[PDB]
Amino acid sequence: LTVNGDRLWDSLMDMAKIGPGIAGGNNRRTLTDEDAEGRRLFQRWCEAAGLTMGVDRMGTMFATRPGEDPEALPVYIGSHLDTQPTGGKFDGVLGVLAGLEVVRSLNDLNIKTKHPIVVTNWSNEEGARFAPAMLASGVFAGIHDLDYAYSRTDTDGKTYGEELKRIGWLGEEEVGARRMHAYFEYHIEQGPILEADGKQIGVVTHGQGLWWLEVTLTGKEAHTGSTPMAMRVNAGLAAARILEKVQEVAMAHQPGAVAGVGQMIFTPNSRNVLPGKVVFTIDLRTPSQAKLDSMRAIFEREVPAIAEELGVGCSIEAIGHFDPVTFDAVLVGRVRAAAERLGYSHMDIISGAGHDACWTARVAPSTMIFCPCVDGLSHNEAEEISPEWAAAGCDVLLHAVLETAEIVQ
Amino acid sequence: LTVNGDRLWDSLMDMAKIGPGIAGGNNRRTLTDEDAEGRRLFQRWCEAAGLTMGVDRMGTMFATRPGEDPEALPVYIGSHLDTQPTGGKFDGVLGVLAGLEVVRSLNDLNIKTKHPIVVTNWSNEEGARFAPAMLASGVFAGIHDLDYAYSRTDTDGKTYGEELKRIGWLGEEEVGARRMHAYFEYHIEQGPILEADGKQIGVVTHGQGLWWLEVTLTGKEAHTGSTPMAMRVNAGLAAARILEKVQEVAMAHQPGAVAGVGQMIFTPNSRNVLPGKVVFTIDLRTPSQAKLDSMRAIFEREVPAIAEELGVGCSIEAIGHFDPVTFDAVLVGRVRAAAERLGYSHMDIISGAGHDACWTARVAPSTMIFCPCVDGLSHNEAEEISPEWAAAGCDVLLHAVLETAEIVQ
Ligand SMILES: [Zn+2]
Ligand SMILES: [Zn+2]
Ligand SMILES: [Zn+2]
Ligand SMILES: [Zn+2]
């Protein structure tokens, strides 16, 4: 049994035509008109494949294929259609549309299952327009209330909840109200491991835990000409030395830990004035609870000490956190076995990023499947997979789901 | 014997009322309409003091007080009325309005001079809106042609030359056509030295030379979750290590050198994506030619080696440069002597920043006078001096000018 990879591929290219970016990728941020366009197209496809559409109060979309057991809970296949402003075509979209290809493959064969199958598009997974990321799955898994989620505002000062109403995807359903037999998410690695190790299938075992530590450094705004070295209070240098320490800390915890900085903000950011304020986020991740606690403790001690070294003030706010996630070992094994059975090359991998699956794992037996991506490139328009990679993992998805939903024939 | 410090102070407070900033300072950037308003008020004052106004093709304003010798070249008293967006009330303004106070004090006493005195408001000294700084004095001293200066455009894409015409300060006079007997500029220190050493008067002997080395680092945009440490090409860490090098190089060149970074720009600047591009300016300065060449050479060699260490691409563009300026020893001497005779405390100081004086020094015997400023604060709305500080240095200015222009009696 396999999926129609050509049909999968075509769907990916059709969805990529909505909210196209500036370089062959996508800018289809959550709750834009472009996102509404993608939602509608997906719904059209879902209906054409015999699925009934449910929508929750966060706008998550649940497309149900009936099971033959009316008491059986559904096997959910989820991801997200929303993208980064420099979005790739495959991040998120692959998982959603793989779920759709699974259905279509089951419809082609008239397969009946005991469990219903529900293909799921989570609202605002990316957290690019409204933070946090994984916002709708967050409410679903009880991580935060609807109120909190609704009040998230974008860089235009519009709220999530207003925008959700504006495009008319404020659904009827209570968020978190569905119980899942199981949850699968198929996604690109967003990293270079599978490609570099030549593996078609990443058997996701865990998701790495993280802290986002937002560091605000307070310097003295001082002309870089007229201020002698000995009288500088240099928040940019402090930031710099902290970035070194972050690298040193990450390296002391190898293997299987990361830390680094993506976002750095100097104020005023003039060429001839030392910053009054420097803000940055230390992103530290590991599947190892001990390493995550250890890096976080180290940062809490050393970051202000490095600031203090330069007379720079320092406050640290935890703006993101979850502990390492263990995917359901039975579902993991199904994915591993299916990859073996299908003759695909495969390895076990840690999910480096968070996904909606990391939240569903709290309320439901959850796992993920990875396919490779070229050069580990993600969150960028040049993000690439082959149709062969797309289909390989969708095949593993088909098998793992069908084993879980249970074929009636 | 002295200036009216009350009248000086009042003029400062009147000028600070035009294009007021957010917080006690000024946003009266060059060739804004509020710049035009400041120009107009200064002209009104100038005319009421018996000065005739000339304007060059850059909009520099030259207010002449007659001399008794019709062949004598003028003693120029210059600064600028344009401010940083978060400008202080005193930067530039003090010099121009001190020139006006000198005139008024000479008029109060009906003093005649051999040399005419010209009060000068240079256009776009700050270089906030249209870069570089010292644009009008630059053209005056032949550093750059009118073409280049006119073609400077702001962040809105309006050109300097359009804007100059818009406000109707495109003057008749050929830029650089005036020959100066002498040039004085009275300016705040913009640094903490005079304040820290309890001196009222900075006798400026030299202006430090500079290089501005804009470094563009090319990294790999890579998710900070999904990318293993060993596969990162981290342009932000490269930037960090370069900032540390910059500090270590600065500290090796003490005494009498600076280097540091005010401007840092990460792209895309997301929390979960390592930058594809980091741009920053290494601002390095010293009155020592040897140390300036040394620092420059060391950066040109070591910055790419730091980048190469991390696999980061590196490109260095010199975006600004002038050599150390020696102010005219005779005019320096007069400033020092006038401070001594008047009983003000005083020290020799190096101009940390560039000023219009540093360009006039090419075509004319030039010097500067500094007064203190609170905490070295400049290019910020909380930039502060006392009326006492303002007046002490304007007194030294009156004496130095009158000795140079020569009293008739
Ligand atoms: Zn995703
Ligand atoms: Zn993503
Ligand atoms: Zn100035
Ligand atoms: Zn200034």
Residue numbers in the entry:
A (entry chain A), B (entry chain B): 7 to 415
Quote the authors verbatim:
N‐carbamoyl‐β‐alanine amidohydrolase (CβAA) constitutes one of the most important groups of industrially relevant enzymes used in the production of optically pure amino acids and derivatives. In this study, a CβAA‐encoding gene from Rhizobium radiobacter strain MDC 8606 was cloned and overexpressed in Escherichia coli. The purified recombinant enzyme (RrCβAA) showed a specific activity of 14 U·mg−1 using N‐carbamoyl‐β‐alanine as a substrate with an optimum activity at 55 °C and pH 8.0.
